[PDB]
Design a protein around this ligand. Sequence first.
Ligand SMILES: Cc1c(COC(=O)[C@H]2[C@H](/C=C(/Cl)C(F)(F)F)C2(C)C)cccc1-c1ccccc1
Length: 252
Amino acid sequence: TVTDIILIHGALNRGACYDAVVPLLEARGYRVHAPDLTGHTPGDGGHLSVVDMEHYTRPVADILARAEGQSILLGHSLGGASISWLAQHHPDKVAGLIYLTAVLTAPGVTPETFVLPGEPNRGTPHALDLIQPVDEGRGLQADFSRLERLREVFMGDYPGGMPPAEHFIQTQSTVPFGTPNPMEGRALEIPRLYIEALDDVVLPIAVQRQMQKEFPGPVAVVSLPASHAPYYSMPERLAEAIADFADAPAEY
Ligand SMILES: Cc1c(COC(=O)[C@H]2[C@H](/C=C(/Cl)C(F)(F)F)C2(C)C)cccc1-c1ccccc1
């Protein structure tokens, strides 16, 4: 019944960041997609071209349109805002939701709740320190005056200096940060899995667990001993857990 798995990147990233995971899931008999969201393909217009979430998430809605059966949606970090939005508008196409140290907000809550300081167990101050606003808060861009800090904070999981340029973009749209989760009704029956990254310092495990705690209804959880990017440091263990979920998301 599940034919496709769609892996969705987070802020400042592109689908290619999943390159170590895609073939492993393909060996589990799945068709695997890792698309660029809107604004994430060099030459497409970049951050100011994103109008709203329907626009931002439209490359996935396209994939879900032509899938033979049901799909698993995975979001990394900010990518969770997209899979929640998509689940609500394509609940008939999504059989499961995977939040990989990802923004999991309750219906009506925007991601900024957990990024900005607050109580309890809210805040990603390492990211706000290193990622700065541009174009009057319509864009965010990394602080390139602190390259080693950027690497050790966000790309510490990369095997062997840094990931290749194909994995990243220069400027991110603030559109997903400010959009509330519209999941209601049918979408809240979709089985949900949170994969925690225990040593994440971008999104601390306390914040991760606080998000699970405040979402209404059950959230399954598996824990990985990784920092911000498990798709770089343990693709095998990560793809294994994704495929076991896809095999039977209702039971996992
Ligand atoms: C951003 C980035 C990432 C994914 O990070 C995220 O999406 C963070 C986002 C939170 C926040 Cl507050 C923010 F978006 F602002 F960072 C979560 C949603 C907590 C992964 C790997 C490298 C870089 C990066 C690539 C090039 C240069 C620097 C870093």
